[PDB]
Design an enzyme around this catalytic site. Structure first.
Site, PDB file in Angstrom:
ATOM      1  N   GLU A   5       0.865  -1.203   0.000  1.00 25.90           N
ATOM      2  CA  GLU A   5       0.000   0.000   0.000  1.00 25.90           C
ATOM      3  C   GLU A   5       0.896   1.246   0.000  1.00 25.90           C
ATOM      4  O   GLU A   5       0.801   2.118   0.877  1.00 25.90           O
ATOM      5  CB  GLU A   5      -1.063  -0.103   1.108  1.00 25.90           C
ATOM      6  N   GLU A  56      -4.097  -9.004  -1.773  1.00 26.94           N
ATOM      7  CA  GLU A  56      -4.484  -9.082  -0.358  1.00 26.94           C
ATOM      8  C   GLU A  56      -5.960  -8.671  -0.339  1.00 26.94           C
ATOM      9  O   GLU A  56      -6.288  -7.569  -0.803  1.00 26.94           O
ATOM     10  CB  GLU A  56      -3.604  -8.135   0.479  1.00 26.94           C
TER      11      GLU A  56
HETATM   12  O1  LIG Z   1      -4.389  -5.219  18.625  1.00 30.97           O
HETATM   13  C1  LIG Z   1      -4.747  -5.639  17.495  1.00 30.97           C
HETATM   14  O2  LIG Z   1      -4.842  -6.862  17.235  1.00 30.97           O
HETATM   15  C2  LIG Z   1      -5.045  -4.639  16.399  1.00 30.97           C
HETATM   16  O3  LIG Z   1      -5.561  -5.265  15.209  1.00 30.97           O
HETATM   17  C3  LIG Z   1      -5.451  -4.376  14.098  1.00 30.97           C
HETATM   18  O4  LIG Z   1      -5.686  -5.062  12.853  1.00 30.97           O
HETATM   19  C4  LIG Z   1      -4.440  -5.531  12.304  1.00 30.97           C
HETATM   20  C5  LIG Z   1      -4.609  -6.950  11.736  1.00 30.97           C
HETATM   21  O5  LIG Z   1      -4.918  -7.855  12.801  1.00 30.97           O
HETATM   22  C6  LIG Z   1      -3.359  -7.419  10.966  1.00 30.97           C
HETATM   23  N1  LIG Z   1      -3.693  -8.682  10.258  1.00 30.97           N
HETATM   24  S1  LIG Z   1      -3.293 -10.134  10.915  1.00 30.97           S
HETATM   25  O6  LIG Z   1      -4.251 -10.413  12.002  1.00 30.97           O
HETATM   26  O7  LIG Z   1      -3.402 -11.310  10.036  1.00 30.97           O
HETATM   27  O8  LIG Z   1      -1.901 -10.002  11.499  1.00 30.97           O
HETATM   28  C7  LIG Z   1      -2.880  -6.352   9.996  1.00 30.97           C
HETATM   29  O9  LIG Z   1      -3.836  -6.257   8.923  1.00 30.97           O
HETATM   30  C8  LIG Z   1      -3.751  -5.178   7.974  1.00 30.97           C
HETATM   31  C9  LIG Z   1      -2.811  -5.433   6.778  1.00 30.97           C
HETATM   32  O10 LIG Z   1      -1.514  -5.616   7.313  1.00 30.97           O
HETATM   33  C10 LIG Z   1      -2.814  -4.241   5.811  1.00 30.97           C
HETATM   34  O11 LIG Z   1      -2.175  -4.473   4.544  1.00 30.97           O
HETATM   35  C11 LIG Z   1      -4.227  -3.763   5.545  1.00 30.97           C
HETATM   36  O12 LIG Z   1      -4.203  -2.392   5.177  1.00 30.97           O
HETATM   37  C12 LIG Z   1      -5.339  -1.770   4.684  1.00 30.97           C
HETATM   38  C13 LIG Z   1      -5.253  -0.425   4.352  1.00 30.97           C
HETATM   39  C14 LIG Z   1      -6.340   0.231   3.838  1.00 30.97           C
HETATM   40  C15 LIG Z   1      -7.543  -0.431   3.653  1.00 30.97           C
HETATM   41  N2  LIG Z   1      -8.646   0.283   3.154  1.00 30.97           N
HETATM   42  O13 LIG Z   1      -9.687  -0.302   2.377  1.00 30.97           O
HETATM   43  O14 LIG Z   1      -8.676   1.622   3.518  1.00 30.97           O
HETATM   44  C16 LIG Z   1      -7.636  -1.764   3.974  1.00 30.97           C
HETATM   45  C17 LIG Z   1      -6.533  -2.428   4.499  1.00 30.97           C
HETATM   46  O15 LIG Z   1      -5.080  -3.717   6.679  1.00 30.97           O
HETATM   47  C18 LIG Z   1      -5.163  -4.934   7.388  1.00 30.97           C
HETATM   48  C19 LIG Z   1      -6.237  -4.736   8.376  1.00 30.97           C
HETATM   49  O16 LIG Z   1      -6.523  -3.619   8.926  1.00 30.97           O
HETATM   50  O17 LIG Z   1      -6.879  -5.797   8.723  1.00 30.97           O
HETATM   51  O18 LIG Z   1      -2.732  -5.089  10.673  1.00 30.97           O
HETATM   52  C20 LIG Z   1      -3.941  -4.579  11.219  1.00 30.97           C
HETATM   53  C21 LIG Z   1      -3.638  -3.137  11.624  1.00 30.97           C
HETATM   54  O19 LIG Z   1      -2.524  -3.140  12.535  1.00 30.97           O
HETATM   55  C22 LIG Z   1      -6.415  -3.208  14.304  1.00 30.97           C
HETATM   56  O20 LIG Z   1      -6.140  -2.174  13.338  1.00 30.97           O
HETATM   57  C23 LIG Z   1      -6.296  -2.591  15.701  1.00 30.97           C
HETATM   58  O21 LIG Z   1      -7.499  -1.889  16.009  1.00 30.97           O
HETATM   59  C24 LIG Z   1      -6.065  -3.585  16.829  1.00 30.97           C
HETATM   60  O22 LIG Z   1      -5.622  -2.831  17.971  1.00 30.97           O
END
Ligand SMILES: O=C(O)[C@H]1O[C@@H](O[C@H]2[C@H](O)[C@@H](NS(=O)(=O)O)[C@@H](O[C@H]3[C@H](O)[C@@H](O)[C@H](Oc4ccc([N+](=O)[O-])cc4)O[C@@H]3C(=O)O)O[C@@H]2CO)[C@H](O)[C@@H](O)[C@@H]1O
Ligand SMILES: CC(=O)N[C@@H]1[C@@H](O)[C@H](O)[C@@H](CO)O[C@H]1O
Ligand SMILES: CC(=O)N[C@@H]1[C@@H](O)[C@H](O)[C@@H](CO)O[C@H]1O
Ligand SMILES: CC(=O)N[C@@H]1[C@@H](O)[C@H](O)[C@@H](CO)O[C@H]1O
Ligand SMILES: [Cl-]
Lengths: 385, 74
Positions: free
Chosen positions: A67, A185
């Site tokens: 991204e 993804e």
């Molecule tokens: O404490 C926690 O567990 C926090 O969780 C966060 O979500 C995490 C995901 O758990 C993690 N995925 S995993 O469980 O398999 O490890 C990871 O996911 C991201 C991913 O890395 C990334 O490429 C993606 O980015 C985007 C960006 C933009 C958009 N969009 O349409 O605007 C979509 C996706 O996002 C994934 C995702 O959010 O699931 O990382 C995230 C973020 O760290 C929460 O964000 C927290 O609230 C929790 O505290």
């Protein structure tokens, strides 16, 4: 918020051996935020990793950055698509001088194509499109924090995916006509998934529909976020139990072939009865060359009965109907295939996926809020041989 | 009624997907979990992953751009 972390040869080994032992092809994302004085990509860390992977004979495919459209918000660094294409050209030169000369390179792993992302993707493909094997982009329907049960069942939410796909192909056809397009993804909901939704039977409507549309519209590969991990959108939970979307993914893998066809419902109104048609997977021992696999989603609150057209009206059909195991209904983490709960036989053995043979000429029953595969035996479709 | 006629286009393939069309990811974030070796060593998890073969396994996510290789860390 994001801080730098290190990973070891041990971690790389854990990941490669997992993929090798599992028959999976590893794609490894390199760090794009390592920058020289003039915001050129600094390849020195990637060089340390390429040499180590070569020294172990690891056959690995590469990506660079995740991204990049959001690098300003994530790291207060702006890299334009031109500069990123140049960074990919430099990674391509390193791979071409490595032991795996023909290793594949995918990118740029942009988010869904809003105006600024589409502009970055266009300038990226103008600059670096010659060295990538496929164009990668990402898609989520919803924010996991605010998503509702209704959202997971809403054809108006499912349909937003169609306009994202069309916009990505408009950029690619304007710059690198014919270049393969991958969803690098994807899942239901970002922020780790929607609690008590992204890990349930209800998540399957978005997953199967996305697979059906991606295949119909020309996307070659769809990468599900995630197989395993902390997020609610995992196929397999941290106790190593498969969730409904695992069993749906396994059925799709066994039944759905590479050759994409088309199905549609008469009277048009493609909203709540969604239908997809491929040739049957030639690796499924049960079936033969020429067989069709229909898959269908019913988002109505009543059972619908599908009638197959001539010349398939009187063929033997094998039904693979998925329904939740109670008492949690669509919010269940357990699924039944034709009334049998899907569960591992033991830690080394997946269960058999048992079909329900229908009475030839019978209409295909699809209960409310359900999805099913249907294999049309002895279909003898010439396109599928 | 609740009876619906389908129409099928069967004359030729409209697209060809990869044999690995249905692929999966592991989030870069998981490499920062202390139990990373325990988790991915799981024979149950490898059995589940083998079920989706052939497929790509993409290792990436936001943490992609916040991870540095350290050849000393062992
Ligand atoms: O404490 C926690 O567990 C926090 O969780 C966060 O979500 C995490 C995901 O758990 C993690 N995925 S995993 O469980 O398999 O490890 C990871 O996911 C991201 C991913 O890395 C990334 O490429 C993606 O980015 C985007 C960006 C933009 C958009 N969009 O349409 O605007 C979509 C996706 O996002 C994934 C995702 O959010 O699931 O990382 C995230 C973020 O760290 C929460 O964000 C927290 O609230 C929790 O505290
Ligand atoms: C061309 C360039 O800027 N090279 C840098 C180098 O100075 C630095 O020591 C190294 C280690 O992080 O990263 C790279
Ligand atoms: C079209 C465009 O804006 N290209 C810019 C280039 O002019 C600039 O020197 C470089 C480094 O920041 O980033 C890119
Ligand atoms: C089987 C069932 O639940 N039927 C409901 C019905 O009573 C409701 O009024 C209609 C429109 O909202 O949706 C459906
Ligand atoms: Cl090209």
């Amino acid at each position: 918020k994001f801080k730098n972390s290190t990973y070891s040869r041990s971690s790389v080994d854990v990941l490669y051996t997992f993929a090798n032992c599992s028959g999976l092809d590893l794609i490894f994302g390199l760090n794009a935020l390592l920058r020289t004085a003039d915001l050129q990509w600094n390849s020195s860390n990637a060089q340390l990793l390429l040499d180590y992977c070569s020294s172990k004979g690891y056959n690995i495919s590469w990506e660079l950055g995740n991204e990049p459209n959001s690098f300003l918000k994530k790291a207060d660094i702006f890299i334009n698509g031109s500069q990123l294409g140049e960074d990919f050209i430099q990674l391509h030169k390193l791979l071409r001088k490595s032991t795996f000369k023909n290793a594949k390179l995918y990118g740029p792993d942009v988010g869904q194509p809003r105006r600024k992302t589409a502009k970055m993707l266009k300038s990226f493909l103008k600059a670096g499109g010659e060295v990538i094997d496929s164009v990668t982009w990402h898609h989520y329907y919803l924010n996991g924090r605010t998503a509702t049960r209704e959202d997971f069942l809403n054809p108006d939410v499912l349909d937003i995916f169609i306009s994202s796909v069309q916009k990505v192909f408009q950029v690619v056809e304007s710059t690198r006509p014919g270049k393969k397009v991958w969803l690098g993804e994807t899942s239901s909901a970002y922020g780790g998934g929607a609690p008590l939704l992204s890990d349930t039977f209800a998540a399957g409507f978005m997953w199967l529909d996305k697979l059906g549309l991606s295949a119909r519209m020309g996307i070659e590969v769809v990468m599900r976020q995630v197989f395993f991990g902390a997020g609610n959108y995992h196929l397999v939970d941290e106790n190593f139990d498969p969730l409904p979307d695992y069993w749906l993914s396994l059925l799709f893998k066994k039944l759905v072939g590479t050759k994409v066809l088309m199905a549609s419902v008469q009277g048009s109104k493609r909203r709540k009865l969604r239908v997809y048609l491929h040739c049957t997977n030639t690796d499924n021992p049960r079936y033969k060359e020429g067989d069709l696999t229909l898959y269908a989603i019913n988002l109505h609150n009543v059972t619908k009965y599908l009638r197959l057209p001539y010349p398939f009206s009187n063929k033997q059909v094998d039904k693979y109907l998925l329904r939740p195991l109670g008492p949690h209904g669509l919010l269940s983490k357990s699924v039944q295939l034709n009334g049998l709960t899907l569960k591992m036989v033991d830690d080394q053995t997946l269960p058999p996926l048992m079909e329900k043979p229908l009475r030839p000429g019978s209409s295909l029953g699809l209960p409310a809020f359900s999805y099913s595969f249907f294999v049309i035996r002895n279909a003898k479709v010439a396109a599928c041989i | 009624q609740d009876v619906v006629d389908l129409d099928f286009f069967t004359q030729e393939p409209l697209h060809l997907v990869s044999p690995s069309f249905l692929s999966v990811t592991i989030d870069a974030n998981l490499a920062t979990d202390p139990r990373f070796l325990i988790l991915l060593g799981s024979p149950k998890l490898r059995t589940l992953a083998r079920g989706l073969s052939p497929a790509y396994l993409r290792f990436g996510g936001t943490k992609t751009d916040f991870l540095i290789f350290d050849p000393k860390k062992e």
